[PDB]
Structure 1
Amino acid sequence: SHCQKTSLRVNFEDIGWDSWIIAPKEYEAYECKGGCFFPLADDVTPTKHAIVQTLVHLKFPTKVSKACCVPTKLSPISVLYKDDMGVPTLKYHYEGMSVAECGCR
């Protein structure tokens, strides 16, 4: 019930990227889901601002929003993409594609 990494399988044609991504068809991107509320967990790595804003949200729930559970570290995947000549080319480390860690920010 707190900020944590959970599964998210993404299909590239569902998001309109199949026009340039030949392969893979789908990959595990994960997502960060869960609440940022007190008491927090031991491993969500909360920033001081995320802690402060969550406290302000308690006192003023209609004015200030709470902190958000988001990726704090991302990992690459490899993709096979068509280049300007229609030739399948490998992008070995397409960065920023999969969640490695989540946290409250």
Structure 2
Amino acid sequence: AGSHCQKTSLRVNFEDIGWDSWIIAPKEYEAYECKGGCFFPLADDVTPTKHAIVQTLVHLKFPTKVGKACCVPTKLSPISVLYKDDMGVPTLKYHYEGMSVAECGCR
């Protein structure tokens, strides 16, 4: 129950991923993530493409030859970061795009 593709929390520390060299702040942010399966019956809000549906059916028929559709971010949102200028000046990037999950779906 409720095991399908959905947005869940993912707290990211920039030091952990080696970005603290060029990102002064914040130290961490909420990137979220997309988790869950793409299998029938699908959840209503998965917004699945026709190809994802086709591939899921093919995987059912031939599970060893063809993989499943994948639960992935389908829309992303920006965050603000404070980063080192090439001259060293800490500088605000106000909309640093593509950093946090707005919506998930099967693709």
Normalising by structure 1, we get a TM-score of 1.00
Q: Which runs of 4+ in 1 moved over 3 A?
A: none
8, 27, 36: which one aligns with 2:10 = 8
How far does the alpha carbon of each residue in 1:63-98 deviate from its partner, in whole angstroms, 9 at most, with x for none? Answer: 000000000000000000000111100000000000
Superposition RMSD in Å: 0.3
How far does the alpha carbon of each residue in 1:34-57 deviate from its partner, in whole angstroms, 9 at most, with x for none? Answer: 000000000000000000000000
C-alpha distance in 1, partners of 2:26/2:84?
A: 12
C-alpha distance in 2, partners of 1:84/1:70?
A: 34
2:103 maps to which residue? 101
What is the count of residue pairs matched by the alignment? 105
How far does the alpha carbon of each residue in 1:14-62 deviate from its partner, in whole angstroms, 9 at most, with x for none? Answer: 0000000000000000000000000000000000000000000000000
C-alpha distance in 2, partners of 1:8/1:34?
A: 14
C-alpha distance in 2, partners of 1:84/1:29?
A: 26
C-alpha distance in 2, partners of 1:50/1:66?
A: 8
What is the percent sequence identity of the aligned residues? 99
C-alpha distance in 2, partners of 1:78/1:17?
A: 14
Query: What stretches of structure 1 of length at least 5 have no aligned partner?
Result: none
* SS of residue matched to 2:67: coil
Normalising by structure 2, we get a TM-score of 0.98
C-alpha distance in 1, partners of 2:40/2:28?
A: 36
